[PDB]
Amino acid sequence: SCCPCCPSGCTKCASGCVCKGKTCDTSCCQ
Ligand SMILES: [Cd+2]
Ligand SMILES: [Cd+2]
Ligand SMILES: [Cd+2]
Ligand SMILES: [Cd+2]
């Protein structure tokens, strides 16, 4: 897993976790 704020995948978090920046909106993974 990565973060409970994303699915068990998220190509965005696949490289790590882009959620380290902000919460998780259209400017994060959405
Ligand atoms: Cd997340
Ligand atoms: Cd994500
Ligand atoms: Cd993540
Ligand atoms: Cd995110």
Curated annotation (Swiss-Prot):
Q: Where does a divalent metal cation 5 bind?
A: 3, 5-6, 19
Q: Region labeled Alpha — which residues?
A: 1-30
Which keywords has UniProt assigned to this entry?
Answer: Metal-binding, Metal-thiolate cluster
Binding of a divalent metal cation 6, residues:
6, 10, 13, 29
Residues engaged in binding a divalent metal cation 7: 19, 24, 28-29
What molecular function does GO assign, one term?
Answer: metal ion binding
Where do the annotations place a divalent metal cation 4 binding? 2-3, 13, 17
Indicate yes or no for the key word Metal-binding. Answer: yes
Q: Which residues form a coiled coil?
A: none
The text the record gives for the protein's domains is: Class I metallothioneins contain 2 metal-binding domains: four divalent ions are chelated within cluster A of the alpha domain and are coordinated via cysteinyl thiolate bridges to 11 cysteine ligands. Cluster B, the corresponding region within the beta domain, can ligate three divalent ions to 9 cysteines.
Instruction: Provide the function of this protein.
Output: Metallothioneins have a high content of cysteine residues that bind various heavy metals.
The Swiss-Prot or TrEMBL record describes its family as follows: Belongs to the metallothionein superfamily. Type 1 family.
Q: What is this protein called?
A: Metallothionein A
Organism, scientific name: Notothenia neglecta
